[PDB]
Design a protein around this nucleic acid. Structure first.
Lengths: 162, 127, 106, 256, 56
RNA sequence: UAUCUGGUUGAUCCUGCCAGUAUUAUAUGCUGAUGUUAAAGAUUAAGCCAUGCAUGUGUAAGUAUAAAGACCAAGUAGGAUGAAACUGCGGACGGCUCAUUAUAACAGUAAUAGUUUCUUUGGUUACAAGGAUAGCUUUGUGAAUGAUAAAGAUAAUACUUGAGCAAUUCAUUCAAGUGAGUUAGGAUGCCACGACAAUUGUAGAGUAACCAAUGAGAAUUUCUGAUCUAUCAAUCAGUUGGUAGUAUCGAGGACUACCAAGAUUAUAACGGAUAACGAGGAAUUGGGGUUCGACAUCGGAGAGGGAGCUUUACAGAUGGCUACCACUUCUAAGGAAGGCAGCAGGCGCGUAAAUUACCCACUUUCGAAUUGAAGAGGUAGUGACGACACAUAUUGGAGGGCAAGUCUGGUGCCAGCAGCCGCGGUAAUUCCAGCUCCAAUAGUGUAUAUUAAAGUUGCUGUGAUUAAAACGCUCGUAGUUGAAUUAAUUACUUUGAAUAAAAUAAGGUGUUUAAAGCAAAAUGAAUAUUCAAGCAUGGGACAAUGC
């Protein structure tokens, strides 16, 4: 090793570089959210696969397993307040059933769309990047902000940002 | 310098070892001082950790002891007679432990039971 | 050799049978630093002495421009291709030339 | 390594020193004294992390050398004095006193010691040997060598020590009816009652300790620091009362 | 504002300042992203006797 | 994501390889709006080096008339302070590199009842003798080094004398913790060393030995564990064991003298290779695994090459010395010292890698000690090695693999393209070009290499009639495997004990998100370990050891 500070990757390119079925199925999602490139498709995919691993690994063990009680509940607990999983779904099996549209729907470009500020999802990029949007008490210029459940009634416009 | 490590020896299989490092001070060695018969002359050596060793070069008087009478008085060493290790030590009259020597019991065959090269003096008992 | 205590032969058999691998043996024998002009080096630097025209193989029909290059490390003579069209005019003699393989590995 | 080392690397320090990984290149190596390398907390750590009086080590030197801190009955003026077990601490300038006790969360905790109760500090005997001239004596867990103790006092007992007088008050034997604070590995930081001891001649003696609530754990004999007799505690226990919570109410409560 | 604690041994007080736009020594003066709100860490040493000796 | 596709034929089904593909690290072509983070002369030369720095240190308590003290303040034992110099401590820490090294070192583990300091901590044991020495004054030499002699003086917490038991050797004996001791310990008799500075501030302690902690420390040592090779089958003579001595801090063939022939080996001894420092770990994996680890941290070794020593608590020291081998410097030609595998920088080597900057303010070390020093450390500059967030632009290609043109000019098996099949001999979907769009995007191709693909190295897991491949056949040692049956170890199996951190998985925490960090608005994850060994324990079905 060289450096004491840690680093990590967020997106991995697909194994097959060319598929006619994997471009429309991406533009149908890229055009739905008005993203910039194809990284966020993989970045959301990488995040979903990350949490899918723990649930799949934990599901193999019995209910009385101590790690299932501790790590399994802590996985749902984080998944609950993040807004990915509705509160009424409280089983480890529902984590695998989650798709990539759930995490994409919690992006700030999608939350401000449903609040009534940007008519088009492409127009919301300027508002978030221009610092017109404040989440409670802090200005935000990162469109990929995944809000929590408590902050859903808390996104609103700022007050004459510089 | 003299060293006391096993790095220069051979394994139990006859395999000659290979050198990885040079000689180290932690395994020092020093030449023997064959304590002969002559005027009292003792050199004090500066050992490791600052301790001092009395290296006897030539002694004549030893504090022999008698176990059957419980008396410990000095007596003059006459000559080295018998040694259990080397008969050539007799000719040089080297004073080492276990060397059967003869004395005249003026204040009273003796075997040296000390380390003149370390303690710096000759002591024994009565055979 | 399937027995529980029969791990001595299965390791011995795998050791001996691995040497038949044409590629694994190539990267372990002491010939890359001896027979391969490049060795582990990615590229090589040398000088241009003689220019060749290598006629294409039987299915094709043409003359491929080529040069003869002597390295600065080994001193052996090797043949290099011209990556583009009309590049023999640009190439010269006694100038720094970089040589790095082809599509196929060595 | 031509001789003893003088620098301690940041990452080689004991993990229970709370030291960060990006704080600096080196960690303050405790000087030699009564407590071991991994059995002690440096005085600089106490006054910079546990107490937050000094922002950095520049101001740590301007405090200890001012004869402001008294360790046990005497007073020490070493910036890296090895402060180990519950030996008392006194800072009369700020009218606050502490104690270096363990805890269940694998650390050193500073329980509050009142002025009256800082005058004593229990010590665990490590060995009893009879020196030359028929003058027997004992050595405690801080290396303290004292004069003639009770002839009944054995090697693995605990004594009630005084600071101003430096005398013995009470001694508790090591039996099947005492309470101990653990100072070792898995169980260190726990309080319980010795219920059973099993002795293996070859390697180790193993004891069984049962908590107040009924939890039972096991540890080595070197780790048994007797704190009292008959479910009685002679010192003020830490905030969590030395009891072991089996993680059931650790993650859950920290959310709220 | 924020937190006000007094050092009983170093004869000073530690405070956390927050800008909403000789005896005071100001360090840590940095602002947020894009400017505007600014913070810092003001230290006050009151009497000059302690300040002249409790300083690098 | 437990994944394949093009290529032998007129066509089909196979074995089988080549090519394609994705990822990691090395160099380079094109391009490069930013902010966070960040490797960087390791591979080839542990090759050679100009220059500048990297270990120095002073309080009221070691010694100070400096003719220094009108620079704070006067001064009758020397006022506060005080450069120097004597003395004390340190440069055996730290930083750098990976040449040697194949049961060697190293990792876990047990021992030191076979050794042990330094520093630190607890406890114990004459109203004051003496010389000389620097700093101080005076004479010089030579080009000189941190060069140098004589003379006149002058002090000690420098060197000795001197007064009020502890520990060491031998011979005998009495004998209680510990699993374990003629053991701690006591007593008897000589032998040796034999003290608690002939010590210090007017105002803020030190010394000499000894017992014990330090310290799981250092060092020796026990058990297990390491890549390929039989075109390496036999290897060793201080070698294996014993006795006595020697040396060491200490056991010990570590060394010497005498006696015996013993020690290892197909379970691979001995020897050979390395582009071999070992580990925590990294890259990639459905599982199993393969490769890498000079380099953050720990352990080992070295300072161009060996060798021998001084100081001391620790050095076989090299930013110490001495001799030789090979280099290099000034020169007054007589002579002198030097070792950048420390920090910047230079030559050479190369595919291969940055400023001859500032500061001890962060972390820590050393010191006579709050203050001095630190090319450690921090800051600053280059930096498309990489990782994170985010503006409005290039590369490769457009036959199949593989997304993208049944467009237009020439060339005429020529130039050329082409990773594989292939396209080009006059109507080219591939050449050189004009227009258009396909993939990615501050990234994008190439060359080399590890990994997956590869069930093309097989334990999981292959094939052997005909594709490669059952010895001509039988006997046979080592090795492997071995029918049913019973109402002291080992292996197996289950729990624990203890086990460096960092790293992997993570528990929480709006660095605004994210990479990150362990921080903040008291918490440190129980953090899960740890392959292979070692200890304890519940069980005895399947197993081996002879009765």
């Amino acid at each position: 090793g060289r450096c004491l500070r840690n680093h990590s990757i967020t997106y991995k390119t697909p194994k097959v570089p060319y598929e006619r079925e994997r471009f429309d199925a991406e533009l149908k999602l890229v055009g739905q959210f008005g993203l910039k490139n194809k990284k966020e498709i993989q970045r959301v995919h990488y995040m979903l696969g990350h949490m899918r691993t723990i649930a799949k690994v934990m599901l193999m063990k019995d209910a009385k397993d101590p790690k299932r009680l501790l790590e399994g509940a802590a996985l749902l607990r984080r998944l609950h307040n993040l807004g990915i999983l509705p509160r009424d779904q409280n089983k480890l099996e529902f984590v695998l059933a989650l798709k990539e549209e759930n995490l994409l729907e919690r992006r700030l470009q999608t939350l401000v769309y449903r609040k009534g500020f940007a008519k088009s999802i492409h127009h919301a990029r300027v508002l978030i990047r221009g610092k017109m949007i404040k989440v409670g008490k802090q200005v935000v210029d990162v469109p990929s902000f995944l809000v929590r459940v408590e902050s859903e009634p808390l996104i609103q416009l700022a007050d004459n940002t510089p | 310098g003299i060293t006391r490590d096993s790095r220069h020896k051979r394994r139990a299989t006859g395999g000659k070892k290979n050198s990885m490092q040079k000689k180290k001070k932690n395994t020092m060695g020093r030449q023997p001082a064959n304590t002969r018969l002559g005027a009292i002359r003792v050199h004090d050596v500066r050992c490791r950790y600052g301790i001092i060793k009395r290296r006897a070069l030539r002694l004549e008087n030893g504090n022999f002891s008698w176990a059957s009478q419980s008396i410990t008085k000095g007596t003059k060493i006459l000559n080295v007679v018998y040694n259990a290790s080397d008969n050539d030590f007799v000719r040089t009259n080297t004073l080492v432990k276990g060397a059967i020597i003869e004395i005249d019991p003026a204040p009273f065959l003796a075997c040296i039971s000390s380390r003149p090269g370390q303690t710096g003096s000759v002591e024994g008992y009565i055979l | 050799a399937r027995g529980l205590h029969a791990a001595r032969k299965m390791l011995a058999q795998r050791r001996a049978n691995k040497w038949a691998d044409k590629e694994w043996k190539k990267g372990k024998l002491v010939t890359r630093y001896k027979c391969n002009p490049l060795g582990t080096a990615s590229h090589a630097k040398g000088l241009v002495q003689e220019k060749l025209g290598i006629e294409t193989k039987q299915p094709n029909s043409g003359i491929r421009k080529c040069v003869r290059v002597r390295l600065l490390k080994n001193g052996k003579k090797i043949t290099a291709f011209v990556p583009r069209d009309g590049s023999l005019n640009y190439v010269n003699e006694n100038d720094e030339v970089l040589i790095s393989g082809f599509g196929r590995r060595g | 390594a031509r001789g003893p080392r003088h620098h301690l690397k940041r990452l080689n320090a004991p993990h229970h020193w709370m030291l960060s990984k990006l704080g600096g290149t080196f960690a303050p190596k405790p000087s030699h004294g009564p407590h071991g390398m991994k059995e002690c907390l440096p005085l600089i750590l106490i006054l910079r992390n546990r107490l937050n009086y000094a922002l950095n080590g520049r101001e740590v030197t301007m405090i200890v050398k001012n004869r402001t801190i008294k360790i046990d009955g005497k007073i020490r003026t070493d910036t890296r004095y090895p402060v180990g077990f519950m030996d008392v601490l006194s800072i009369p300038r700020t009218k606050e006193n502490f104690r270096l006790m363990y805890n269940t969360k694998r650390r050193f905790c500073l329980v509050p010691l009142t002025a009256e109760q800082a005058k004593f500090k229990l010590c665990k005997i490590e060995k009893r040997v009879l020196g030359t001239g028929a003058i027997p004596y004992i050595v405690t867990h801080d290396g303290r060598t004292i004069r003639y103790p009770h002839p009944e006092l054995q090697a693995n007992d605990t004594i009630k020590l005084n600071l101003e007088t430096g005398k013995i008050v009470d001694f508790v034997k090591f039996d099947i009816g005492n309470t101990a604070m653990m100072i070792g590995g898995n169980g260190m930081g726990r309080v319980g009652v010795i219920v059973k001891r099993e002795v293996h001649p070859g390697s180790f003696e193993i004891v069984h300790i049962k908590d107040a609530k009924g939890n039972t754990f096991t540890t080595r004999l070197n780790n048994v620091f007797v704190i009292g007799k008959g479910t009685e505690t002679l010192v003020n226990l830490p905030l969590d009362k030395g009891i072991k919570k089996p993680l059931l109410q650790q993650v859950n409560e920290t959310i709220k | 504002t924020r937190n006000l604690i007094v050092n009983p041994l170093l004869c000073r007080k530690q405070v956390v300042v927050d800008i909403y736009h000789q005896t005071i020594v100001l360090n840590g003066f940095v602002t947020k992203y894009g400017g505007g709100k600014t913070s810092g860490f003001a230290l006050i040493y009151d009497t000059l006797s302690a300040l002249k000796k409790f300083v690098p």
